[PDB]
Amino acid sequence: SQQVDKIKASYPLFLDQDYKDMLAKKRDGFEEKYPQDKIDEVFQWTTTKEYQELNFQREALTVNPAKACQPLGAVLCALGFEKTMPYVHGSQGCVAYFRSYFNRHFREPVSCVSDSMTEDAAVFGGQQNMKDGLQNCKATYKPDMIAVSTTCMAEVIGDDLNAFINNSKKEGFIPDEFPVPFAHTPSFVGSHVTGWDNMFEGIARYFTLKSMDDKVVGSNKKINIVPGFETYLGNFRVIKRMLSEMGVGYSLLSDPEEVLDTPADGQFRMYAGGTTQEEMKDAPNALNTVLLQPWHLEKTKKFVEGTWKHEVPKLNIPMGLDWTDEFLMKVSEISGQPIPASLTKERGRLVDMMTDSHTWLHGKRFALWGDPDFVMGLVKFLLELGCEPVHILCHNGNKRWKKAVDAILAASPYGKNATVYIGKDLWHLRSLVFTDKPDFMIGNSYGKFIQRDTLHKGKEFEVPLIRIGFPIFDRHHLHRSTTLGYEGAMQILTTLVNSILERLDEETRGMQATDYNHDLVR
C-alpha cells in the first residue's frame, strides 16, 4: 500500500508488514535457504584469523578487485585533448561500460566510440571496422583528432592498429593529415593506469617522433606537466593555479577538466578545452617535463627522456606537505621562478591546520587503497599527520613500488605497524579490517560493502569508510575535490579530522550513557 501524501520508495516500503510477511513466505516456501544459525556461523568464520589465512592463499580467484582495465585509462587520457574522440578498436560492450563507469563518477557525458567488431572479425580481423569506424566517427561527431585504443578481443585476434590506420588513410576513409594516434591497450596486462600511460605515449609519439630535427630543449621556456590518470577536477585546477601563481610557463598535457565540467546552460558541448595539438607538437621545446604520477607513467618517461631528451626529475606525486614542497622547489629550479609569497602563505596555512588538528589525528589507524601514486601520497601525508597507515592495498601495485612505500614507512615512527599489499583485492582487505581493525578506511565506493560487513559483526567493530579515490558513485560531486598540493592536503586533513569527530559524536550521543563526552567544543 501507499499513502499518497507520503510515498515510500523501496526503502522503507518493503519494511511494511505485508511485504515482510510475503518475503518470509517466499524464503520458507521456495528458496531452500540455509538456516539463519548456519549463516551466522559462516559469517563469524569469515571474520577470523583462520579464514584470513585461507583468503590470503588464493592463487586463482579474485574477489572485489580494486582496479579496472587498460582502455578505461586510454579513454580518460584521450578526453584530455582538444576536440578529441576516444575510439576503442574492438567490441562495443567495453565502450558502454567505460562510458557508464565515468558517467557515474563525474555525473557528466562521456563521449567514446567503438567500431563494433563482432565474431566475424575473427576470420580476417578488424581492418574494415577501423576504416568505416574512423570515417563514420569523423563525419558524424566532427572531432579534430581520434585517439585509438583496443579492447581485449582485438588484442587476442592480433589486429595491427598501425597498419589498419595507415590502410584507412591509404584508401581515403580519413584524410592523410587527420591525426589518429593509437595505442595497444590489452586489458589482461596491468590496469587502467597502464592504458593511460600507453595512450599518452602513443599521442606524444604521434605528434613529435618524426619532427624532432627542429626541436631545441628549453627554447619555449615552458614546463610540460603530464597528470596521469586523474579523476579529481580539483587536481588539474590546482596544478594550473599553482604554476600560474609562480608565473611558470607550462603545458598541461592531457587536460579533461573542461570537458568533464561543462555548464548546464541549454546546450550539450561534446568537446571543451583540452591540450591542443599545437601544444603536443611544441612539447619537446619545453625546458623539461614533470610526471605527476610517475609510478604509472614509466612508458611516457622512457619516451620523453629517450626522444625529447628531457631530464625528467625524480619527483613524487605532489601530495601532502613534503612532496608539494619538493615539487614547487624543483619547478622553481627548472623554471628560474621563485616560489611567491602567496604559495608560501598557503603552505603555512596548511601547517597551521595540521597544528590545530593534530591531537585528534594522532595515532589514528587507517586501511586504504587506490592507484599506486595516489596510495603512496596518502600514506606519506598520513605519516606527516601522525596517523598510522596500517593496511595499505594497491591491487595494481608492483614490487618496486612496494619497496618505495616500505622505505617511506621505514623512515617514520608512524609506519612501524603498516603493511603494504600488492595483487590483493577488497576481499583480502575485508579480512585485514576484521583481524587487525583500524579506525577508518580511506577508499572508493566499493569500500561501503566492507563497512556494511564490519557493522554486521557489531557496532564496536564497524570501520567507517572515508571516500577518497576512484570511483565514488554513492556521493555527489566529490569528483570536484582536490587531493594534490597544499589545497588538496587541506581538503584531505579536513575530511579526516571531521570523519574522526563525526564518529566520536555518534559514539558519545547516548543519553546518560556516553554523552558525558558529547562535548560542544572539540
Binding site: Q2, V4, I7, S10, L13, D18, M22, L23, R27, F30, E31, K33, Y34, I39, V42, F43, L54, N55, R58, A60, L61, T62, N64, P65, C69, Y87, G93, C94, A96, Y97, Y101, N103, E108, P109, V113, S114, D115, S116, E119, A122, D132, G133, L134, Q135, N136, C137, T140, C152, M153, V156, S187, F188, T262, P263, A264, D265, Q267, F268, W427, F449
Partner: protein
C-alpha cells in the same frame, strides 16, 4: 509535428552520414503506423551496429551476466576473463535481493579470474578449476557457480564446459558454463538467449524425476522480472493477494531452488518477453506449462494483467482479483488526482533496451502524458510488432539509435521529458530537458504494480516540474 515533418527530420539527420551508414540507419528509423502489424514492413532490428557511431548498446556478457544470471542470489557468478567486465558491471544494476552478502548471497560481489597474459597465451582452464576450489573453500554456502565468459574465452579456445562437468561431478555442485563472450551476437540480446539456454541445459531439469513438491492449482512463476528497485516484490504481492502462489521469480531476488522448482508450476507469467521468451517456450514444449505476457506498469495495465491472469484459473481467483482491484482503486486514484494535473499534456521520448520502451507507455498515459518517440537498443521485430499498436500515429521509432541521432531528434521534437539510460542522462540535462533514468529508475522505484505507480508518478513529477529547469539561462543572456 506532423508525419511529413518527422520523415523530413529523419532525412535531414541522416545527411551527416557517409553513404554506407546512411543507407543502414535509414532502415532503423520509422514513423509509426499502428495499422501495421508486421514491423518488418516498417523497420529493421537486431542487426550489427555501424562502426564509430556511438551506439548505446552493450554486449552478450552484459545480457547474460548483468541481466539474467547475475541476479540469482545464492549462486556465485564468475566473470571469467580479464578484470574490466566484472568491475564495470559490479552492482551497476539494481536487481534487488534479500540475503547475507558474502555469506549466502553474492549478487553485488565481483568474482573474477582476472586473466593475465599467461592465461591468454596458455588458456584459463587450469586457473578456472583452481578458482572453483577456492570459491568452495571461502564461500561454502554457495548453492552453485556460473562461469560467465568474457571476450577472450572463446577466442583462445578454452573448454569451460569440460571444467564445469569435471568440477561439478567432483564437488556434487551445479556449475554452469555460459558462452556469453562479448564478440557474440550484436547486443545484450544474444546474451539473454545464451543465458536461457544455459539454464535449460544445466539447471532447469534437475528435479525432472522428483515428485516431492507439494503443488497447488494456483502455482505460478514470474518470468523476466529482475526486481529493479524491488519491482518483482511489488508485482508478487499482488499475485499472492489474488490467491496465486508465486513459486519462482526469474531472476530478481531469485534462488537456484526456485528456478529448479519452476517446471512444477501451472502458469509462467512473462514480463520481459525479450529476455525470457526462450525458456518460456522451452517449458511449454517440455513440461506443457502455458505462458502469457503481462504488464504491471501503471493501473490500467496492472488491472488488465490481473484480470487476464485470473481468467486462467477458477472463479475463486477471479473473485479475489476483483477484491485486489477494489482494494487498490482508492490508492492509484489518489496518485492520478495528485500527479496527473501536474503532468497532463507533457511529451516524453524514451530509449531503453528490449521491453520498457513499449511497456511503460500505459503508465505515462495513466498520467495524461504522450510518448512522442520510443526505441530500443536491441529489440527484435516481434518487439516492434508489439510497439506499433501501443504508440500513437506519426510518432517516431528508432532502433539502435546513435548518440548523434538521439540528440538531433530531441533538439527538433523538444520533448518535455526524456527517459533513457546513464549514457544519455547528462547530455539532456545540459540541454535543460528533464531526464529520468528508465533502467535504474534513477535509484528510485519500484515502478511495477500499484505501489510502484505511486513512486513513478512522484518521480516523473519531481523531475519534470523541478525548479532547476527554469534556471539554465542566465538572466543577462
Amino acid at each position: 509535428m506532423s508525419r511529413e515533418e518527422v520523415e523530413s527530420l529523419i532525412q535531414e539527420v541522416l545527411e551527416v552520414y557517409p553513404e554506407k551508414a546512411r543507407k543502414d540507419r535509414n532502415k532503423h528509423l520509422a514513423v509509426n503506423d499502428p495499422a501495421v502489424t508486421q514491423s518488418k514492413k516498417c523497420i529493421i532490428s537486431n542487426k550489427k551496429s555501424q562502426p564509430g557511431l556511438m551506439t548505446i548498446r552493450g554486449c552478450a556478457y552484459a545480457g547474460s551476466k548483468g541481466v539474467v544470471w547475475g541476479p540469482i542470489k545464492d549462486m556465485i557468478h564468475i566473470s571469467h576473463g580479464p578484470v574490466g567486465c566484472g568491475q564495470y558491471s559490479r552492482a551497476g544494476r539494481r536487481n534487488y535481493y534479500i540475503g547475507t552478502t558474502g555469506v549466502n548471497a553474492f549478487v553485488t560481489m565481483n568474482f573474477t579470474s582476472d586473466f593475465q597474459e599467461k592465461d591468454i597465451v596458455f588458456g584459463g582452464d587450469k586457473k578456472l578449476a583452481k578458482l572453483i576450489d577456492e570459491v568452495e573453500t571461502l564461500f561454502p554456502l554457495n548453492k552453485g557457480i556460473s562461469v560467465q565468459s568474457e571476450c577472450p574465452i572463446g577466442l583462445i579456445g578454452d573448454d569451460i564446459e569440460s571444467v564445469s562437468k569435471v568440477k561439478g561431478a567432483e564437488l556434487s555442485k551445479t556449475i554452469v558454463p555460459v558462452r556469453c563472450e562479448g564478440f557474440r551476437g550484436v547486443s545484450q540480446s544474444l546474451g539473454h538467449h545464451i543465458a536461457n539456454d544455459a539454464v535449460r541445459d544445466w539447471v532447469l531439469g534437475k528435479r525432472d524425476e522428483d515428485t516431492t513438491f507439494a503443488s497447488t492449482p494456483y502455482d505460478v512463476a514470474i518470468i523476466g522480472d529482475y526486481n529493479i528497485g524491488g519491482d518483482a516484490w511489488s508485482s508478487r504481492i499482488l499475485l499472492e493477494e489474488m490467491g496465486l502462489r508465486c513459486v519462482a521469480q526469474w531472476s530478481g531476488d531469485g534462488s537456484i531452488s526456485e528456478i529448479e522448482l519452476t517446471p512444477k508450476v501451472k502458469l509462467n507469467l512473462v514480463h520481459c518477453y525479450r529476455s525470457m521468451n526462450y525458456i518460456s517456450r522451452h517449458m511449454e514444449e517440455k513440461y506443457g506449462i502455458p505462458w502469457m505476457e503481462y504488464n504491471f506498469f501503471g493501473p490500467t495495465k496492472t488491472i488488465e494483467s490481473l484480470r487476464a491472469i485470473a481468467a486462467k484459473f477458477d472463479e475463486s481467483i477471479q473473485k479475489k482479483c476483483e477484491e485486489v482491484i477494489a482494494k487498490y482503486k482508492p490508492e492509484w486514484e489518489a496518485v492520478v488526482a495528485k500527479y496527473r494535473p501536474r503532468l497532463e499534456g507533457k511529451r516524453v521520448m524514451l530509449y531503453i533496451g528490449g521491453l520498457r520502451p513499449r511497456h511503460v507507455i500505459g503508465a505515462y498515459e495513466d498520467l495524461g502524458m504522450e510518448v512522442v518517440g520510443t526505441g530500443y537498443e536491441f529489440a527484435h521485430n516481434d518487439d516492434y510488432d508489439r510497439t506499433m499498436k501501443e504508440m500513437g500515429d506519426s510518432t517516431l521509432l528508432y532502433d539502435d539509435v546513435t548518440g548523434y541521432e538521439f540528440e538531433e531528434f530531441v533538439k527538433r521534437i523538444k520533448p518535455d521529458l526524456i527517459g533513457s539510460g546513464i549514457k544519455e542522462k547528462f547530455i539532456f540535462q545540459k540541454m535543460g530537458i528533464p531526464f529520468r533514468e528508465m533502467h535504474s529508475w534513477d535509484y528510485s522505484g519500484p515502478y511495477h504494480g500499484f505501489d510502484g505507480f505511486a513512486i513513478f508518478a512522484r518521480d516523473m513529477d519531481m523531475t519534470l516540474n523541478n525548479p532547476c529547469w527554469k534556471k539554465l539561462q542566465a538572466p543577462w543572456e
